[PDB]
């Protein structure tokens, strides 16, 4: 039984070295330490100092050098007794503060234990090297085991989700976070491989190519949906939910992908040093001479949509080699060579559209002097250039019953062209997903286990509308986690008959969510929509209105002291300041019907599907004319949340250890920022308000019997013995609660009992 | 080294309030005997004063860690009576009775909580012994019915430990093969390597019989041997215990018995004290080297 055999790879790579005699009697004294910040500006960089003095409301310790400081006991981050080093769940720590959480992750990472639970979360730190814990032999160990029967592992989360799906006949979701480099793509692959292995029905037919197809969808979706931003070279700018589907007997039957919230604005504008979506650079770098000739291609410097940010390449990334991978993936998921060329023609056409330069003609009317870009776009799109030219500068509308051409000026023509580009790109993205699903989903499912990953909580020096949307999505998903943790905690306290009550943790997020999307009183999105109706509004009247409705009236909002154009929102991950510039423009999403009429007549098979398929195209309207971008956003998010609320969720948090791609180098500043952005610290905050440590009575007595007079180590009535120890030590009863089978302790109290044990043993 | 027994005396004091832990194993001597063996008389003759509770049946209802320390002066102290010096041994007996009743609900049951009594006296050698409840069948007392098992279970907690030397006390005027002390010592120490035998009441044996074969270590062999004693109680003018006369009477007994004269120098209370002091000291010397590290791992 490898789970008990200290010589197995299960023990070598998934358990703490302790074994039995090793980590258990390695001395210990009576000295206590504290975690502190050597430089107050870097709040996530710590060192360990020795406590020296001790007073009423403060401690006194010597910095790692010898200098001295003091800290209000109310703010001190004490270090846990050595017995707590390496625990498999952060909830087992007694001092539950940020540096202590990092320390435990580090004790484990330094022994190559990359998986650690933190309450409901499975935290997975990229080791930046291969560890042999994904073999068939490891799969067999996890098969059918409960989370508390085995060490932390992505296979444990996967198995529990699979058994719950079968036992409860309920779909499951696995919400996984992590920026590129965190190991999220690899962990998601392990989930899929694990499910294919335990739910495989491979005898006779083999396992086919479904797994391979699901994995190959990645390079395609990343090429069109990921981009370099100032904080990550490969940032996902969309959300995706990959359903691994099963038949009624529990065997894998197929998969499906659904995308959400793609950032279409990036196609037409990118901030300094960022890039447009990777596919544009891949195509220009890897197309063959003949493909460049037929698509009228040139270098990225030659296109307005790729030459404004100052950055066209990524250090260490070959866009040409990445294009090769993208095409190979397209072959595997079934795109014909002709469909692939049509996809590239549309990407080329978007670039040519971006190069059209509208000029003021004789009067205000826009005109096109040089028809080069127009003609190149028309050729690759398979449309009539005269029709496209008129649809761009003289789109017709109905004035009463009369068809009238609105002759646009330069600004409106440029804007319409951009709107056409964003529509083409978004529809193309939906068509790619639909085409991939043509091969992934060929049987009606009975159930599914879906993996969700979306853009992570984002903070830049200057944050705009796109960032508020991304962060609002993250806020809603964190409330979803909080609510589920609440339901699970309610059941644990009730099962133990613990005398402590609490309300739905999801309510802690309501103030921020209401600030953003409330309707009554109206939140930010509602006031942005209100300000998008009349021409009297400006970005300045918009922020004045936000300050008027929320400054000093909503605790989660801040009118900054020294900026007239930013407003602050306190999210679970901290405060984010948002710049209002251009929000009114960004909320408008109209597309001229004459442009759709133009493209509906394309001679290209894929272009016609983007404009004739009522699903990919159109949507509806609003009994009016068009839904704002904020209303579209809110609706896609609501659709995603409704899907999640039908499932039983599981949460995985993948972490980058450092930003140098170096193994064995866990950095606190880098790790703590991610734990803050991914909700782990929010889970810890909640955990600290209750009773995190829960100890079976007999185990408490076995360890602490010596701290009280005449209490047998193996006392027959473990509850009375536990009470005798607590009463003799004069523990404040508010710091613990007796349960039917375990004693519950508030943060810090068990560490103090452990410290008393260490002291008593050294005395003896 | 005159320092080993005192060192373990401090450890016993420190563990006196630490409840049972099967892994904690200090080098010490546990006194085991059937209720009829006269084990109280053996201890009172070391001290030279009557100081143990008197009553029918059980005399020790809580383990008594009795630390004897040779001294020029004579007085006693209980660990639970900080700073008090007892010079009247009748008060010592009364305090053992009071402290015992204080803990035991029923006035006849037992408790594992020890009473830690140290006696300084010119009549003793440096020696420590843990007296335990004597064994008996018929619960004849007043609660509980399973008393025999409760006593045996408490005795086993002590003597199943490897560092516990066993002082097995048996009366000569009985069937020594059926000795409760020697039988329980054989259950836990089959090779008879950590059991010291004491044969009491030698002067009470039937006319024409003697315990020579057991005293010579031939009939019921024990590596650490057997020592015979007799309680020939002498009272002084006031009617109180006269140890010098009692020890002289015991000496006269062994010198004049034709079956024991040749062993007299290895019989009697003074010799038994000498033997226990020597064997306990050597045992501590043996076990001390690995002690500190072991304790850390067992606490």
């Amino acid at each position: 039984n490898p789970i008990h055999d200290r010589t197995s790879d299960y023990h070598k790579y998934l358990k703490v070295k302790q074994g039995d005699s090793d980590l258990f009697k390695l001395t210990v004294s009576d000295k206590r330490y504290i975690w502190y910040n050597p430089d107050p500006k870097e709040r996530d960089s710590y060192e360990c100092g020795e406590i020296v003095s001790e007073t009423s409301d403060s401690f006194t310790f010597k910095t790692v050098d010898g200098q001295d400081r003091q800290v209000k006991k109310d703010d001190a981050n004490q270090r846990n007794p050595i017995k707590f080093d390496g625990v498999e769940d952060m909830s087992e720590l007694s001092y539950l503060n940020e540096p202590a959480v990092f320390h435990n992750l580090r004790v484990r990472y330094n022994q190559d234990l990359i998986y650690t639970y933190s309450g409901l979360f499975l935290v997975a730190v990229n080791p930046f090297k291969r560890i042999p814990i994904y073999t068939q032999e490891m799969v067999d160990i996890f098969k059918g085991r409960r989370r508390n029967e085995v060490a932390p592992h992505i296979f444990a989360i996967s198995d529990v989700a699979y058994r719950s799906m079968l036992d409860d006949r309920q779909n499951q979701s696995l919400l996984i976070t992590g920026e590129s480099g965190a190991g999220k793509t690899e962990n998601t692959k392990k989930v899929i491989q694990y499910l294919a292995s335990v739910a495989g029905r491979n005898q006779a037919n083999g396992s086919g190519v479904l797994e391979q197809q699901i994995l190959q969808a990645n390079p395609i979706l990343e090429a069109f949906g990921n981009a370099k931003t100032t904080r990550n070279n490969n940032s996902s700018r969309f959300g995706k939910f990959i359903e691994i589907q099963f038949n009624s007997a529990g065997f894998i039957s197929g998969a499906s992908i659904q995308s959400y919230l793609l950032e279409k604005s990036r196609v037409v504008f990118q901030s300094e040093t960022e890039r447009n979506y990777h596919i544009f650079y891949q195509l220009l770098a890897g197309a063959t001479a003949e493909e460049k000739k037929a698509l009228h291609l040139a270098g990225p410097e030659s296109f307005n949509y790729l030459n404004q940010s100052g950055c066209v390449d990524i250090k260490g990334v070959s866009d040409s080699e990445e294009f090769k991978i993208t095409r190979q993936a397209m072959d595997i998921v079934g795109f014909s060579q002709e469909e692939q060329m049509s996809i590239f023609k549309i990407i080329a056409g978007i670039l040519h559209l971006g190069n059209i330069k509208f000029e003021k003609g004789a009067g205000e009317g826009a005109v096109l002097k040089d028809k080069t870009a127009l003609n190149a776009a028309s050729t690759v799109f398979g449309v009539n250039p005269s029709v496209l030219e008129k649809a761009l500068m003289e789109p017709r509308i109905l004035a009463g019953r009369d068809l009238v051409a609105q002759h646009l000026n330069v600004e409106k023509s440029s804007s319409s062209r951009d709107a056409l580009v964003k529509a083409l790109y978004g529809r193309l993205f939906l068509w790619l997903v639909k085409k991939i699903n043509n091969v992934l989903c060929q049987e009606r499912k009975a159930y599914f286990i879906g993996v969700l990953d979306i853009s992570g909580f984002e903070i830049f020096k200057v944050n705009s509308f796109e960032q508020l949307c991304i962060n609002y999505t993250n806020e809603k998903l964190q409330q979803f986690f909080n609510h589920h943790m609440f339901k699970l905690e309610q059941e644990e306290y009730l099962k133990e008959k613990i005398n402590w009550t609490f309300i739905d943790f999801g309510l802690d997020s309501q103030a921020t969510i209401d600030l953003i999307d409330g309707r009554q009183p109206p939140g930010i999105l509602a006031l942005l929509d209100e300000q998008s109706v009349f021409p009297n509004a400006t970005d300045n009247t918009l922020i004045t209105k936000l300050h008027s409705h929320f400054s000093k009236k909503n605790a989660k909002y801040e009118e900054p002291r020294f900026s007239k154009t930013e407003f602050g929102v306190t999210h679970y991950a901290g405060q984010v300041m948002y710049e209002i510039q251009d929000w009114l423009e960004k909320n408008k999403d109209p597309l001229q019907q004459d442009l759709e009429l133009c493209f509906k007549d394309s001679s290209d098979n894929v272009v016609t599907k983007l404009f004739n398929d009522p699903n990919i195209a159109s949507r509806a309207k609003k009994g009016a004319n068009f839904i704002t971008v904020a209303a579209q956003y809110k609706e896609q998010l609501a659709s995603l949340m409704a899907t999640l609320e039908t499932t039983n969720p599981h949460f995985v948090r993948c972490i980058i250890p450092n930003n140098k791609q170096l193994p064995a180098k866990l950095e606190d500043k880098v790790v703590l920022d991610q734990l803050r952005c991914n909700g782990v610290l929010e889970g810890i905050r909640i955990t600290r308000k209750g009773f995190p440590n829960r100890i079976i009575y007999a185990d408490f007595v076995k360890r602490y019997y010596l701290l009280a007079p005449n209490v047998p180590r193996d006392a027959e009535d473990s509850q009375k013995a536990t009470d005798a120890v607590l009463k003799h030590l004069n523990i404040d009863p508010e710091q613990y609660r007796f349960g039917i089978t375990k004693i519950f302790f508030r943060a810090g109290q068990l560490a103090r009992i452990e410290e008393a044990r260490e002291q008593r043993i050294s005395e003896i | 080294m005159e320092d080993l027994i005192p060192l373990v005396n401090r450890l016993q004091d420190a563990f006196s309030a630490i409840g049972q832990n099967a892994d904690l194993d200090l080098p010490q001597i546990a006194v085991v005997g059937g209720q009829s063996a006269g084990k109280s008389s053996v201890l009172e003759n070391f001290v030279g004063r009557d100081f143990l509770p008197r009553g029918s049946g059980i005399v020790t209802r809580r383990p008594l860690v009795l630390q004897l320390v040779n001294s020029t002066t004579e007085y006693a102290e209980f660990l639970h009576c900080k700073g008090k010096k007892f010079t009247d041994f009748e008060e010592v007996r009364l305090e053992i009775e009071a402290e015992t009743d204080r803990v035991t609900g029923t006035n006849k049951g037992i408790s594992p909580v020890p009473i830690n009594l140290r006696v300084y006296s010119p009549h003793v050698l440096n020696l420590t012994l843990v007296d335990l409840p004597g064994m008996t069948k018929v619960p004849v007392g007043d609660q509980p019915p399973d008393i025999e098992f409760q006593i045996r279970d408490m005795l086993m907690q002590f003597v199943t430990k490897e560092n516990c030397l066993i002082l097995a006390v048996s009366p000569a005027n009985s069937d020594l093969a059926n000795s409760d002390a020697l039988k329980i010592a054989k259950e836990v120490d089959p090779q008879g390597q950590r059991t010291i035998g004491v044969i009491t009441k030698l002067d009470l044996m039937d006319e024409g019989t003697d315990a020579r074969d057991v005293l010579e270590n031939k009939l019921l062999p024990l590596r650490r041997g057997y020592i015979g004693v007799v309680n020939r109680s002498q009272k002084d003018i006031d009617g109180k215990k006269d140890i010098t006369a009692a020890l002289a009477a015991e000496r006269k007994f062994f010198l004049s018995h034709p079956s024991y004269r040749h062993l007299a120098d290895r019989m009697g209370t003074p010799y038994l004290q000498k033997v226990l002091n020597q064997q306990l000291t050597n045992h501590i010397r043996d076990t001390l080297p690995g002690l500190r590290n072991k304790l850390q791992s067992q606490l």
């Binding site: 005395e763 003896i764 | 060192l7 401090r10 500190r292 304790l295």
Partner: peptide
């Protein structure tokens, strides 16, 4: 433990 000389 400190009661026991090492």
């Amino acid at each position: 433990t400190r009661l026991v000389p090492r």
